[PDB]
Amino acid sequence: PAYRILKPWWDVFTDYISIVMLMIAVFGGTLQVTQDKMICLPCKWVTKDSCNDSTGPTGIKYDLDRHQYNYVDAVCYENRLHWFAKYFPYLVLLHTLIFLACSNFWFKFPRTSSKLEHFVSILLKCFDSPWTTRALSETKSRIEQGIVDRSETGVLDKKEGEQAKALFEKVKKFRTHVEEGDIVYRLYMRQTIIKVIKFALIICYTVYYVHNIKFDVDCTVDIESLTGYRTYRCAHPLATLFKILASFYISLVIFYGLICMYTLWWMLRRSLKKYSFESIREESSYSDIPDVKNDFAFMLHLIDQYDPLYSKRFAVFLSEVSENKLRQLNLNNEWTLDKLRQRLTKNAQDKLELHLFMLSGIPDTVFDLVELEVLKLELIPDVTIPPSIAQLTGLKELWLYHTAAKIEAPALAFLRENLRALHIKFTDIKEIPLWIYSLKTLEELHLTGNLSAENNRYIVIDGLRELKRLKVLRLKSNLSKLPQVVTDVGVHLQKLSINNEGTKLIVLNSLKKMVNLTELELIRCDLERIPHSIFSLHNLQEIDLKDNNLKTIEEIISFQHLHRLTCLKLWYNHIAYIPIQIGNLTNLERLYLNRNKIEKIPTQLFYCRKLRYLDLSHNNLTFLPADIGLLQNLQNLAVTANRIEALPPELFQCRKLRALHLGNNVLQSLPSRVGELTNLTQIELRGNRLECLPVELGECPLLKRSGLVVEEDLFSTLPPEVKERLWRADKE
Amino acid sequence: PAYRILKPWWDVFTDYISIVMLMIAVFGGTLQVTQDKMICLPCKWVTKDSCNDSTGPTGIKYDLDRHQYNYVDAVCYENRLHWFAKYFPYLVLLHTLIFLACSNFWFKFPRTSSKLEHFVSILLKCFDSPWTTRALSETGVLDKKEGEQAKALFEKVKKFRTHVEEGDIVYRLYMRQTIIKVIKFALIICYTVYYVHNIKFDVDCTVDIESLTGYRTYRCAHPLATLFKILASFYISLVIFYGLICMYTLWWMLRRSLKKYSFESIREESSYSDIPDVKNDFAFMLHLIDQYDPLYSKRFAVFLSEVSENKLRQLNLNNEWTLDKLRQRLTKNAQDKLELHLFMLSGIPDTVFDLVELEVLKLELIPDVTIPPSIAQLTGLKELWLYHTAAKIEAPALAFLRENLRALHIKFTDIKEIPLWIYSLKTLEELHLTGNLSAENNRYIVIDGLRELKRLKVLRLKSNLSKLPQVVTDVGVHLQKLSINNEGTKLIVLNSLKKMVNLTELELIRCDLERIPHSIFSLHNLQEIDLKDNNLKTIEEIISFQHLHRLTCLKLWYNHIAYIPIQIGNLTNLERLYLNRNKIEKIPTQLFYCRKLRYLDLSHNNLTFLPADIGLLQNLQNLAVTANRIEALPPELFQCRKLRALHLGNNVLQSLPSRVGELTNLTQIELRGNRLECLPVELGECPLLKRSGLVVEEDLFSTLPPEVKERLWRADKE
């Protein structure tokens, strides 16, 4: 079968020399059995216990019948013929049989036969794998930007990829099962040593004894009482042929010994317990191929001796870069177009979103979508953006959550002319792609992750100057100081949102250069004090100082400079009181002050006649001044988690009030003037000292059962007409 | 095994000859084993150790018992019989064994066995390739799977040629084997024919044992001598034939220099000139196969070539894209033209050149493509887009394009991706360049041939220009429309544009001018000026636009413009004036002196009010003040009856004035996001306004009368 690849040439040679030696052994045996005789004639005159060897001549007479001659032949053949002449073929047969048993012991020893057959089968199926040919088929300024070189990959069938993956798993399991044993190498070493020592023995003693095969043998067999003679001279007819065969056999054994000594030299000097693969990975440039341990590098040295081709065809299949390539090619087939189409969702801005969580790479079937809007790559390793991304004409936002993604020049150009918003989340600078600064159409940047550096502070983001069309910028990076490059690029910024997640920040007179800024958020900057520089921004419209540990906010008087400021948010702080000067803030449309230490609402706050939103929940409020009816523009009001006990009737003067959040209060009785409010749509009642719902609550034109949040104990008190109408309206 | 094709005729003849020689060796060996004796009789009368040989006859009596005859036979046979008479069959057997070992040494030697088995494995399936028969019949429809098989077999052939040609081992073995065969044939003719005479029927032995038998010399008969002589003559005749064949093979192997294969007849007949001659150890296997059959070598050359590779790739691509599936992907572009988009293909499919209705072609990431001369089959084609596609062209196709190409969209990631033959055209009108082309000490050398465009009229240089190129200046003496987009890179002109007096439309988008240059005032024939996204804080320089007597449309949007200079009143000819995305806070009344105004868009600004003078612009058709702080609409807005669409969303509008129904021409109005309460009933008297043109929420649409809802839904239906 395939076992022919195991044997090197020095084993074929000893498989054929063994056959030839066995052939001559069989010939010698079948000659010595049916043909070998000894023709003996007595010597009449004996000199020194030896044959003297000293009318036409007449033949001598011995007066011996034929059977006497046969008997003396038998006796002299048994006694005075050297055993190496009689038993040469049997010795040759025995030595060749033990040579053969030494050469083929491991193939029949079941401890190593299973290992060898498994190895040869797996190497064969790794030689015929169509992935193996494909793997070898592939053979400053730009370099530092993370722009990878163009690379083009094909397709593999689903079944073919499954077979390749299964073969990879089987190869790894076999490698674990085999690299630990080290039984085959020991057996091969023992076999070679035994062959060498046996060659030494049977090339020494055979040459020692080969001189005893003589044609003429003198025997003194000491039988007079049977034949009457003392000594005989005999001819061994097959002595010369046996000598020739013995010389031929010792020549064959000499060649066998030379080849076995070559085998011992090759197996000893190399120290082949480890295979390096130093040629293939220096030729094809596939570094990730580990060196091999015991019991597996010898099985590969034998194969290399048979043919180096299988060594490459297995080393490539044993690499990990190939495994990553196969993983990509299987992942591409794994995700159908429709399965990713169904995976699409809707984001906050009502776009089509695809969130790839925990994938080995980007399934290149995503770039066959035309309707994708936001792509989110979270926890993807060292991925590279292919140039196929240009198919995504609708791509607008790219999210890089812990993915140091590289790109190619065409895809980089396409993003450079189409990308709008980029979301960056990282743990270190290396996870930030450095090619973002070539994106000259980006507008929104979301840098998440610490970036302040020691002795090289604020050097990575120096490319922000290149992003000319940057408008929005959100930084959540535990900043201890405003970076200079951000300050410089703020000259055309139209929004900022910093978030030090509790870290203290010092503006240190730097925010004044962002003359185009309109919205400014400083969340968890631990300011504890509004800097005056914020009031130097003559274009601001949205100021948020969430969780700055603010206590006194009387600086809001300077907000008089801002002549277009509408929305203000100082929620989630320790604001003890609302300063009266807020009444001067005429332009306000929304005001959020929840989650504060606020106790009372001063009346001056109701001079903001354009106010529309008022969120004063989770404070120390105990009542509501009657001026609430002045703000006829009000449409929302939340007083959740307060000590409000009686609702003032004037509250119901604002007819276009669309909501009321009366949760977690001490309201004893809900005023019946609620039916006055024609524009009420969502009113929350859970958490009050209420006992019955006034009927007028149920006559709101658009309020429905779902829109009414209340305990079922209170809802049970509604008139049945009200319950029926609310449920019927809710059902449609 | 399938190695039968690797044996030439002489190898089969030598195998048969060796089998016959082995057979006669076995026969002469068993005969020598079972019967070869000597029959000796002593000579009574001896003359000089020889037999003198000098009433019915009576037999002579030697007085020798049978065993003494056996002993003398053994002694004479051992000593006075020539070794060649005894050991002839064993020598024949040894010579045949070593001949067979020489013959089959390269098959059993693993180093050269692997190469032969791999070569025959590849060649058998190359002969079996379903594409070989088609290609050689052509000297068509094919399955995709068999195309992949053909591609894989091309890969295997390339790898095989890479591996094999380095070897030079099979040739060395097949040389040394024949050398050894020839020398051993010479030796075993030399010694044999010399020694063949020693086989004699009768011999005379003076074995000199008198003490045992009593005689001096004996005459013996060798019964097998005649038969052994016959077999010796037969064996030497066979050896002579063997040597003749071996010397013939040596001469044949030393005639043509088998280390190199010419490979010229097949390439000369089948028109595949891209077949380089194979190196050592690969010419030899082809030579042996040719000795068996040239057909396999011819069926292997098709895969060995390069033209066949490209043709197979083209056939695979053609099978990939059918004509009807190609038509299914045909679409229409924005410019009201028929366009075909090709993205990331190996080459240009040959099937695209049948849809003559195609007008615009786009090539996006299609590497190493040569434009066939068959594009003349497409005459309705008018635009070719080369998107990162460095495409080579042929003389007939280029000559055809020189008279059939008006617009050529070019996008390049590098200079060499720009075709050098684009300027060779002469009927071209529109050229779009998209890519950085700046260089240091070799600045703007790529577009030097731009002067050859004697017909160019439309240009668009989105090329990251830090300066206005000099070749553009030289060529602009005939241009009409110029578009420039620097992607935010500052543009430097500095008196390098005014040579272009034939211009009519000029666009400087994202050039970061920060200030209108005076040179534009030289362009007297200019009619449409755009300065989008130039960080323009003030636009006072437009006062100089009095020179331009046909300025109709002016756009200054996406800037930081603070105010509208009143001098804009002098620009009476303005028809469409875009100023959205600006820091403008108020509208001077002088802007209303331009009564010819038809489009006025002022969205995304700092506006708070609308002047009553807006009724003076009776020619106004579309007005947009979206995303502003406009409190209420003045009734003078409705003085301009021909208003067809208003954009009023994202504002602080409280209620809609009732004069809305007065404007019959009003076909659209946008009001989403405004603090609106109830729509006026006059919305029911709008003649051509429909639901699609009424951009408003359904919760406010509920306020509209059901008659108005009926009319709106009826208009929406038809």
Curated annotation (Swiss-Prot), chain A:
Tree of life domain: Eukaryota
Intracellular or extracellular location(s): Cell membrane; Lysosome membrane
Membrane topology recorded in Swiss-Prot or TrEMBL: Multi-pass membrane protein
Modified residues (Phosphoserine): 141
Membrane-side (Cytoplasmic) residue stretches: 106-188, 266-732
Disruption phenotype: Increased prenatal and postnatal mortality, growth retardation, and multiple tissue abnormalities. B-cell development is slightly impaired, without affecting B-cell function. Mice however show a cell-autonomous early block in thymocyte development and impairs peripheral T-cell expansion and function. Conditional deletion in germ cells leads to abnormal sperm and male infertility: the cytoplasm of late spermatids appears swollen, preventing reduction of the cytoplasm during further development into spermatozoa.
SMART domains in alphabetical order: LRR_SD22, LRR_TYP
PROSITE patterns, A to Z: LRR
Spans within the Extracellular topological domain: 34-86, 211-240
LRR repeats mapped onto the chain: 335-346, 347-369, 371-392, 393-416, 417-439, 442-466, 467-489, 491-513, 514-537, 538-561, 563-585, 586-608, 610-631, 632-654, 656-677, 678-700, 702-725
Signal peptide range in chain numbering: none
GO biological process assignments: aspartate transmembrane transport; cell volume homeostasis; chloride transmembrane transport; cyclic-GMP-AMP transmembrane import across plasma membrane; intracellular glucose homeostasis; monoatomic anion transmembrane transport; monoatomic anion transport; positive regulation of insulin secretion
Reported regulation of activity: Inhibited by (4-[(2-butyl-6,7-dichloro-2-cyclopentyl-2,3-dihydro-1-oxo-1H-inden-5-yl)oxy]butanoic acid), which plugs the channel like a cork in a bottle by binding in the extracellular selectivity filter and sterically occluding ion conduction. Lipids may block conduction in closed heterohexameric channels.
Similarity comment text for this entry: Belongs to the LRRC8 family.
PANTHER family: PTHR48051, RAS SUPPRESSOR PROTEIN 1
Protein's recorded name: Volume-regulated anion channel subunit LRRC8A
Species this chain originates from: Mus musculus (Mouse)
Name of encoding gene: Lrrc8a
